[PDB]
């Protein structure tokens, strides 16, 4: 298991935006409570799950636990960095797991909900 992605930036000032408020209070909150969220709420523990090839295939690990902490810690300078992390999390799932696997159906359900919410992302302001 690699160290988890950094979730706090000591060199970054605290700044709210409409889009980051939306990404935490609407997007993350809605995905987090979903019945299929749980496999995505923490980094893949390749040791506990005995997946010796996972971190060989996945160069950029990402999960909603990391995204949640990043939003709570105001880690993201803008909405697009956060959207990129969600996209990476889904991509990792689709490139590692066989199509139609339970985890892929769970990712597809969450991604459908994610894109539903991102389509209603507030304007930059
Ligand atoms: C401390 C105790 O020690 C242990 O027993 C260690 N092993 C366990 O606990 C393992 N678990 C729980 C668990 C936790 C997080 C996981 N995250 C993933 C996962 C994998 C992959 C490649 C991936 O790409 N991503 C993004 C996530 N998986 C794999 C599963 C993902 C969903 O479809 C089925 C494989 C996870 C597994 C399960 O076996 C367990 C379980 F899988 C259940 F579905 C379940 N539901 N019910 N009822 C349940 F009760 C389970 F306990």
Curated annotation (Swiss-Prot):
Phosphorylation by CK2 disrupt the intramolecular binding between the bromo domain 2 and the NPS region and promotes binding between the NPS and the BID regions, leading to activate the protein and promote binding to acetylated histones. In absence of phosphorylation, BRD4 does not localize to p53/TP53 target gene promoters, phosphorylation promoting recruitment to p53/TP53 target promoters. It is found in: Nucleus; Chromosome. Ubiquitously expressed. There is a cross-link at residue 56 (Glycyl lysine isopeptide (Lys-Gly) (interchain with G-Cter in SUMO2)). The record marks 97 as: Acetylated histone binding. Residues 15-121 form the Bromo domain. JQ1, a thieno-triazolo-1,4-diazepine derivative, and I-BET, a benzodiazepine derivative, have been tested on tumors with success. Treatment with GSK1210151A (I-BET151, a I-BET derivative) has strong effets on mixed lineage leukemia and promotes myeloid differentiation and leukemia stem-cell depletion. The NET domain mediates interaction with a number of chromatin proteins involved in transcription regulation (NSD3, JMJD6, CHD4, GLTSCR1 and ATAD5). It is linked to Cornelia de Lange syndrome 6: A form of Cornelia de Lange syndrome, a clinically heterogeneous developmental disorder associated with malformations affecting multiple systems. It is characterized by facial dysmorphisms, abnormal hands and feet, growth delay, cognitive retardation, hirsutism, gastroesophageal dysfunction and cardiac, ophthalmologic and genitourinary anomalies. CDLS6 inheritance is autosomal dominant. Chromatin reader protein that recognizes and binds acetylated histones and plays a key role in transmission of epigenetic memory across cell divisions and transcription regulation. Remains associated with acetylated chromatin throughout the entire cell cycle and provides epigenetic memory for postmitotic G1 gene transcription by preserving acetylated chromatin status and maintaining high-order chromatin structure. During interphase, plays a key role in regulating the transcription of signal-inducible genes by associating with the P-TEFb complex and recruiting it to promoters. Belongs to the BET family. Interacts with p53/TP53; the interaction is direct. Interacts (via CTD region) with CDK9 and CCNT1, acting as an associated component of P-TEFb complex. Interacts with RELA (when acetylated at 'Lys-310'). Interacts (via NET domain) with NSD3, CHD4, BICRA and ATAD5. The interaction with BICRA bridges BRD4 to the GBAF complex. Interacts (via NET domain) with JMJD6 (via JmjC and N-terminal domains); the interaction is stronger in presence of ssRNA and recruits JMJD6 on distal enhancers. Interacts with NSD3. Interacts with NIPBL. (Microbial infection) Interacts with bovine papillomavirus type 1 regulatory protein E2. This interactions may serve for the tethering of viral genomes to host mitotic chromosomes allowing successful partitioning of the viral genome during cell division. This is Bromodomain-containing protein 4. It comes from Homo sapiens. The chain holds residues 44 to 168 of 1362 of the full protein.
């Amino acid at each position: 298991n690699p160290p988890p992605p950094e979730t706090s930036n000591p060199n970054k000032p605290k700044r709210q935006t409409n889009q980051l408020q939306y990404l935490l209070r609407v997007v993350l909150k809605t995905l987090w409570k979903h019945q299929f969220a749980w496999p995505f709420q923490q980094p893949v523990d390749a040791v506990k799950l005995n997946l010796p090839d996972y971190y060989k295939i996945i160069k950029t690990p990402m999960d909603m636990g990391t995204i949640k902490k990043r939003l709570e810690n105001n880690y993201y300078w803008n909405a697009q960095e956060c959207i990129q992390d969600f996209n990476t999390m889904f991509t990792n799932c689709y490139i590692y797991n066989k199509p139609g696997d339970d985890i892929v159906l769970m990712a597809e359900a969450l991604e459908k909900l994610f894109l539903q919410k991102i389509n209603e992302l507030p304007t930059e302001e």
